[PDB]
């Protein structure tokens, strides 16, 4: 098999910056190769194809490269929507392999998260379970940690993480923390918060709300 | 528009069988050799198997070499995965691609997901995330869905059916302790026109025959209820 490795794996830039990512073939495969742009959860896109041709609609910025063993993608201006992981893919010789692909975040300024806290809801606790979301809105970077507090009681090892990827407008992140108690237990305390502390914010934010106030 | 739509995926048990089918409109269809792209979760794209123009001359990854079988109905403009012996490497979003001789792969699907378990199919619970009294960011307001205790991906949830696409936030799938998975989807709006608007999640979950909408909407907080 024709195996193809890209270099990096991953990388970040910022908008306007040049970005070259590099494909190699364990074979010489000609000038035939294909490089295709995914956005998380979404369908790939060819952007390249027999390495150096932009497929119709393209941007320009995307300029392919190389020959035989050696290829390369070249982004010139990134773009916030450029956040994405592309791949290249052989098209000289069966079986078609693609490489590992290269995943391409988009560096920004420090952006402090908007917290929003959610109380379960009235129908959630008739379940014997409740959830109380903390809702971490449009920051960057992606590092952040969520502190739950029942009662001022630190709370650990009850709480589940989501972080979504990075929007291709404003080149932000958004993170959900789930915290999961029995009904009872939930019932029982008053006082629940979410100390959300991140790189933007000088002392950390908290939000809050009473279990039977509102 | 040049489409390819993705079906028959869902919930297997390790051993069984199901069929991908995939419909293109939009192109010529005779002249395209199709192509199925899986990706499994966390994991990079991976070619499987793909099928010649004229049918007939097919090829496979040597991973599911003997057990997937490529076809194509040049008649109804399908194509064809019959998946046999599946395993649980098999578990990944299955995408159909027409390519143009050497030319690469220029026309996608959307995918189609195949989960790979001997876990039986469950259906969510949708529950809403009521924006607060006060929410004063500024004039915007944050308000959600909760879709909790499912099985297996994925899950589609719409705000107001596809009408309210800005601000949206549908978070990645958490695999809880009790093997089923959960996610919120969240969106902000202006706090202002919280009475005046109507907000709706609409859920589906396809391995189930699931489908709710749930209206949200903000409460007295005075005295709760």
């Known amino acids: 098999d024709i195996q193809m490795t890209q270099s990096p794996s991953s990388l970040s830039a910022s908008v306007g910056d040049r970005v070259t990512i590099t494909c190699r073939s364990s074979?010489?495969?000609?000038?035939?190769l294909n490089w295709y742009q995914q956005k998380p959860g979404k369908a790939p896109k060819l952007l390249i194809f027999?390495?150096?041709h932009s497929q119709s609609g393209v941007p320009s910025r995307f300029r392919g490269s190389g020959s035989e063993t050696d290829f390369t993608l070249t982004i010139s201006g990134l773009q916030p929507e450029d956040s994405a992981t592309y791949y290249c893919?052989?098209?000289?010789?069966?079986?078609?392999?693609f490489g590992g692909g290269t995943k391409v975040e988009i560096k920004r300024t420090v952006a402090a998260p908007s917290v929003f806290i959610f109380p379960p809801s009235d129908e959630q606790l008739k379940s014997g379970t409740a959830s109380v979301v903390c809702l971490l809105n449009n920051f960057y970077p992606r590092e952040a940690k969520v502190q739950w507090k029942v009662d001022n009681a630190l709370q650990s090892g009850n709480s589940q993480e989501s972080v979504t990827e990075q929007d291709s407008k404003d080149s932000t992140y958004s993170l959900s923390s789930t915290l999961t108690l029995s009904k009872a237990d939930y019932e029982k305390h008053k006082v629940y918060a979410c100390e959300v502390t991140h790189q933007g914010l000088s002392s950390p934010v908290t939000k809050s709300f009473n279990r039977g106030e509102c | 528009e040049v489409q390819l739509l993705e079906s028959g995926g869902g919930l297997v048990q390790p051993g069984g069988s199901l069929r991908l089918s995939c419909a293109a409109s939009?192109?010529?269809?005779?002249?395209?050799?199709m192509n199925w792209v899986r990706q499994a979760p966390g994991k990079g794209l991976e070619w499987v198997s793909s099928?010649?123009?004229?049918?007939?001359?097919?090829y496979y990854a040597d991973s599911v070499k003997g057990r997937f079988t490529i076809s194509r109905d040049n008649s109804k403009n399908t194509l064809y995965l019959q998946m046999n012996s599946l395993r649980a490497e098999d578990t990944a979003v299955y995408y159909c691609?027409?390519?143009?001789?050497?030319?690469?792969?220029?026309?996608w699907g959307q995918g189609t997901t195949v989960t790979v378990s001997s876990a039986s199919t469950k259906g969510p619970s949708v529950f809403p995330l009521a924006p607060s009294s006060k929410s004063t960011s500024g004039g915007t307001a944050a308000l959600g869905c909760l879709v909790k205790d499912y099985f297996p991906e994925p899950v589609t949830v719409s705000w107001n059916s596809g009408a309210l696409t800005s601000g949206v936030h549908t978070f990645p799938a958490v695999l809880q302790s009790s093997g089923l998975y959960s996610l919120s989807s969240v969106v902000t709006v202006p706090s202002s026109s919280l009475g005046t608007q109507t907000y709706i999640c609409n859920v589906n979950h396809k391995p189930s025959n699931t489908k709710v909408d749930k209206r949200v909407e903000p409460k007295s907080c005075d005295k709760t209820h």
């Open positions: 691609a027409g390519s143009q001789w050497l030319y690469g792969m220029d026309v």
């Open positions: 939009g192109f010529t269809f005779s002249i395209y050799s």
């Open positions: 099928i010649g123009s004229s049918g007939g001359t097919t």
């Open positions: 074979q010489r495969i000609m000038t035939y």
């Open positions: 027999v390495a150096s």
């Open positions: 893919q052989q098209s000289f010789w069966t079986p078609l392999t």
